[PDB]
């Protein structure tokens, strides 16, 4: 049938034969008390607050773990159930030490709300005054075990959703406790990624983000806006909470998607920490070791005066940010690429972008999409990490890797000259020596398409024949492998093709493309390429006498890029913050809107666009970015010719299905 119907509280509800009673109740509107239930986690059955009874049967059934069967009458509210639930809440309060007066979650705690809805004004039990540890060793997260209901939703979030299995239960019985690795404090645990997925999963105020205590209460917010995390390419959906013009809490929407709502340390620490920064708010001038306030006319006049006297002598450049939206990039490109005919328009991440694209183009000319969705790592069997460190570039990808290798029985092998970014999950660390190992790798995978020689192709790879032999032996025994190619490999557009060829040489196909899943550092990769990113590297080579640098000062920049900016003899930055690395190397420091103040679409690598919503409206009146672009177009003798956005063109089309072709273009 797959279409059943029940009667909850007299109200007839519809559902499917596979769900539980709590799911059928939540599906329409119906309310049932829950404390250990979390959408996105397998039902646990610990609080026993969701108890429910049928007519005739005097037994009590947990609505969250008992399946729904057509024809049953469900009763959620009566004297017996109210009494039992109040007794459970009173046990929870009398067992542990609940001090609502100074709890950080003292207005948005599930236990406190369940206690107030059941009219709890006494505990009726002797109030065991036991000493529980308060763990504040980690500067960011606090675990106050005086407030634990032992719902285990923290142990289920760090195991099935995150992968960093840092939490579990200590000694059984009433002495149950949530511990870190080997009973250590959270700060001594090495298997923690500081993602805060546990803080979002905890219903009580045991796990708490420390720096936003007493402010990040969802009950005393002013507005809730959902948008996307701009920091990395994964683009996790968020649930920003705003209070008095400040982001107090970032929660992960998407408890239905494979990410599970876990955001990275950046997504839920930097974004609320960004709204309380120094906010340039007025054009500055260096004046020598100490900035000075200036009007817009003065700052723009001096900036354009130094910009003209350098553009005539071929020496000028622009370093834009790929965390910018498609409209800002379109305007920048309209000024620099289609109005000034400039040639030095690189991006802070232009090298990774140009490398990935020039390594994947050997496959665009034959009609194959040379990558797949990042969430297929869970369905794989052998994950090969090629010059990647996802814990610093794409934490949700690292979470997929950990979940697959620790709970879905996958094998991990490293193929990089690095620190083996997963020291304890890899079983084959293949460290390549530098030089020209790209042709070596491509000839090595050539044998896997034909014979499936090796010694000759395993000399610059710095592997004795045996090492490369069993590398190939494990690569051939895998039915659905996957490769993770990092941004280091983009130091040469050859190694990207080498990885994409190792992908075809082992039949790593998916219905969306190959098993390559590149780790892009920004989200507007295709947008930046089509608009701003240059074709040849020029930073650190051209001395440069003038430089425009638009940097949304959110993610750090490579030391080399900043050293090239420091030697440019004039830099005009249009950052919104007064952070250290940009106020150190800057001459004007014009103000610009922050990421939580403008809207955009973020044309991505895999095709169709995302959408960033404006969370907090702009405070002051900076009044434009087109203004600066015209005062640079004027004072220089050009027209801007305002264009509209270029459409998403799906650069890598899936024309023909999974018909591999080794590309001898080395």
């Amino acid at each position: 049938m797959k279409e059943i119907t029940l009667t909850i509280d007299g109200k007839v509800c519809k559902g499917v034969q596979g769900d539980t009673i709590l799911d059928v109740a939540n599906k329409n509107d119906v309310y049932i008390p829950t404390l250990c239930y979390q959408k996105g986690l397998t039902p646990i059955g610990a609080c026993r607050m969701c108890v429910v009874q049928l007519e005739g049967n005097p037994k009590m059934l947990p609505s969250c773990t008992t399946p729904a069967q057509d024809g049953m009458v469900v009763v959620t509210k009566n004297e017996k159930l109210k009494d039992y639930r109040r007794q459970i809440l009173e046990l929870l309060f009398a067992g542990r030490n609940h001090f609502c007066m100074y709890c950080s979650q003292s207005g948005d705690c599930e236990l406190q709300r369940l206690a107030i809805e059941h009219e709890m004004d006494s505990v009726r039990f002797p109030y065991l005054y036991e000493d529980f540890e308060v763990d504040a060793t980690d500067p960011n997260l606090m675990m106050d075990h005086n407030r634990c209901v032992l719902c285990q939703r923290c142990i289920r979030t760090c195991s099935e959703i995150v992968g960093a299995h840092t939490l579990d239960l200590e000694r059984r019985g009433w002495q149950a406790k949530v511990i870190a690795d080997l009973g250590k404090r959270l700060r001594e645990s090495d298997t923690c990624v500081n993602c805060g997925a546990c803080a979002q999963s905890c219903p009580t105020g045991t796990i708490t983000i420390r720096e936003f205590a007493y402010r990040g209460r969802r009950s005393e917010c002013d507005a809730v806006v959902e948008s996307v995390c701009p920091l990395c390419a994964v683009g996790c959906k968020i649930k920003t909470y705003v209070r008095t013009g400040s982001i107090v809490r970032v929660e992960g929407t998407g408890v239905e998607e494979p990410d599970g709502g876990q955001l990275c340390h950046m997504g839920r620490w930097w974004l609320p920490e960004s709204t309380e920064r120094e906010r340039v708010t007025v054009p500055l001038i260096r004046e020598g070791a100490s900035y000075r306030e200036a009007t817009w006319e003065e700052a723009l006049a001096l900036a354009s005066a130094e910009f003209k006297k350098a553009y005539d002598q071929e020496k000028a450049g622009a370093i834009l940010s790929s965390l910018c939206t498609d409209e800002e990039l379109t305007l920048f490109s309209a000024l620099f690429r289609n109005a000034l005919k400039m040639k030095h328009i690189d991006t802070f991440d232009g090298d990774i972008i140009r490398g990935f694209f020039k390594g994947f183009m050997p496959f665009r000319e034959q009609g194959v999409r040379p990558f797949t969705a990042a969430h297929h790592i869970l369905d794989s069997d052998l994950i090969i990490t090629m010059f990647a460190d996802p814990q610093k570039e794409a934490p949700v990808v690292a979470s997929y890797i950990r979940v697959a290798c620790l709970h879905r029985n996958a094998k991990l092998m490293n193929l990089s000259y690095g620190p083996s970014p997963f020291p304890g999950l890899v079983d084959l660390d293949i460290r390549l020596p530098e030089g020209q190992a790209v042709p070596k790798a491509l000839s090595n995978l050539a044998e896997i398409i034909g014979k499936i020689s090796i010694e000759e192709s395993a000399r610059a790879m710095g592997l004795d024949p045996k090492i490369a032999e069993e590398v190939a032996l494990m690569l051939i025994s895998a039915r659905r492998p996957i490769f993770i190619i990092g941004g280091r490999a983009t130091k040469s557009h050859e190694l990207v093709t080498a990885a994409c060829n190792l992908a075809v040489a082992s039949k790593a196909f998916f219905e969306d493309g190959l098993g390559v899943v590149p780790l892009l550092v920004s989200a507007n990769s295709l947008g930046a390429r089509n608009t701003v990113v240059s074709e040849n590297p020029w930073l650190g080579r051209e001395r440069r006498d003038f430089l425009y640098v638009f940097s949304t000062a959110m993610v750090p920049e490579e030391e080399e890029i900043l050293a090239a900016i420091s030697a440019t003899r004039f830099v005009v930055v249009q950052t919104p913050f007064k952070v250290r690395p940009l106020v150190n190397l800057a001459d004007i420091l014009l103000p610009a809107p922050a990421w939580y103040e403008r809207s955009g679409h973020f044309c991505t690598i895999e095709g169709e666009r995302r959408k960033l919503n404006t969370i907090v409206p702009p405070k002051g009146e900076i009044k434009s970015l087109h203004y600066v672009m015209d005062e640079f177009a004027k004072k220089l003798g050009v027209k801007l010719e305002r264009p509209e956005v270029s459409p998403c063109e799906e650069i890598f089309k899936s024309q023909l299905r999974a018909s591999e072709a080794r590309i001898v273009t080395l």
């Binding site: 260096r286 070791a289 900043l562 050293a563 420091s566 003899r569 690395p581 150190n584 001459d587």
Partner: protein, 79 residues
């Protein structure tokens, strides 16, 4: 006495700070072939944050001098 001042290779002053706040700005990189370390400005790393010290770097970072016959030659050095 005075404050520590680092000048970019083209004249701009980059992180003029107070001497006691040096652990926030200077770090030493160690190389296997020398008992000598390599100090560098931390915000630019190694080997990009490395700078020069000495008479040349002093006269380049300082803006003026306080003695007559040395100023009369500091001008000729600056030009």
């Amino acid at each position: 006495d005075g404050e520590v001042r680092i000048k970019a290779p083209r004249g701009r002053i980059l992180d003029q700070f107070d001497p006691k706040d040096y652990l926030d700005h200077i770090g030493e990189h160690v190389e296997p072939w020398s008992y000598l370390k390599f100090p560098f400005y931390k915000a630019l790393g190694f080997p990009h944050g490395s700078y020069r010290v000495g008479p040349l770097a002093r006269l380049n970072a300082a803006d003026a001098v306080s003695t007559p016959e040395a100023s009369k030659e500091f001008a000729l050095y600056k030009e």
